[PDB]
């Protein structure tokens with residue numbers, strides 16, 4: 001069982017349950033399968049064949065998930081085009097990917113029309129809500145692909161065959177890569193037992209992590225809630241109405257949800273809700289601000305397209321007082337380049353092996369034993385939790401020993417008088433580097449400098465101690481490199497500078 005057959009099995013055994021819903025629409029598992037079958041028939045009637053690449057370019061809608069599944073059913077290689085791409089970058093990917101067809105919605109197509117319609121290898125262009133005067137040549141209305149009943153034609157799909165290309169470099173997934181990537185993602189979707197759960201991903205469904213989440217949720221029998229851009233702009237209001245059991249988002253997504261409660265009397269109840277902050281870093285500081293706002297125990301996921309899917313999962317960030325990213329998922333193997341130290345660079349190999357990189361003309365094959373160098377520094381505890389020591393380019397050297405800003409910042413944020421902090425170093429003639437702490441005092445809370453110093457005496461080794469404190473009422477926009485370059489400016493704008 002491949003990804004489409006897994007969906008079809010659950011769809012046919014739980015046919016009347018809701019598979020996908022929006023605020024004002026819903027489709028059952030069975031009716032979703034019927035839509036998928038119609039699209040497949042339309043694709044094959046348009047002479048789309050196995051191995052043909054199809055660029056997909058649309059916002060969150062039921063047709064997007066059905067189109068993925070229709071591509072999987074007939075073996076058409078789907079190529080999702082991020083909504084963040086300009087018209088210029090969209091056309092480049094259509095050309096680079098050697099796509100011969102394109103499926104998009106009205107908003108994205110009309111932003112991109114000449115570019116799309118000037119890619120001459122595109123035999124078919126299907127647009128949801130295509131305007132009638134634009135039905136001509138190879139541009140078709142989406143209705144034409146579903147106008148014909150399912151023809152019950154068979155499909156021979158094999159696990160080694162290409163399934164999709166996800167551009168960061170076009171990362172090629174086989175059917176097996178997707179099976180294994182969804183299997184990793186399934187382990188990270190753990191809604192609480194309802195006293196039926198709906199899954200929400202705030203990342204666009206065109207983006208690989210949401211694709212995997214959606215497959216994984218449907219295969220577990222959950223419904224998937226799809227939100228529009230305006231729905232997410234009004235996320236607190238949307239959440240109060242839709243009440244999903246599980247929410248994936250960026251750290252920025254959840255920071256926004258926290259901010260909205262400050263100014264919205266009627267509190268949103270996320271206490272039963274399981275929330276997963278997804279990224280390539282650590283969510284420890286977010287998790288604890290997230291707990292005293294909502295009483296919810298934030299989780300995190302760590303992965304990237306080159307590793308197939310999520311590879312490291314923290315099912316309870318707030319339970320670990322040090323910054324940490326969690327535990328390798330099943331089959332995930334790690335290596336820490338920590339020669340002669342306890343801390344080192346995290347190297348990962350994933351059980352979801354991507355096939356290679358599409359370079360326009362050939363697939364650059366990956367030796368399936370290759371490790372990925374993350375650029376992140378870790379230490380592995382006895383229980384195999386990965387303590388997160390930050391971004392390797394951010395480490396500081398003090399008397400030869402490495403110092404990790406993320407670690408100092410996590411200690412600093414524990415103080416109630418500190419709203420936020422950023423630690424970085426500046427050059428120093430005879431010490432090499434000097435540690436600076438940029439401290440943001442909590443509003444109203446009166447400042448107070450040696451308190452920080454004495455606090456840090458009690459909690460970090462001396463060599464990690466900042467040599468200097470810059471008190472600033474707002475920290476600029478975070479890149480410790482840029483702030484280090486602005487060190488003299490920061491001091492001149494500072495409300496106070498304390499030098500030890």
Ligand SMILES: CCc1cc(C(=O)O)c2c(c1)C(=O)C=C2
Nearest residue numbers: 208278279301302303304305310
């Ligand atoms: C599909 C590969 C993948 C991509 C991304 C991303 O945010 O780009 C993420 C993860 C996996 C993840 O586990 C949390 C964030």
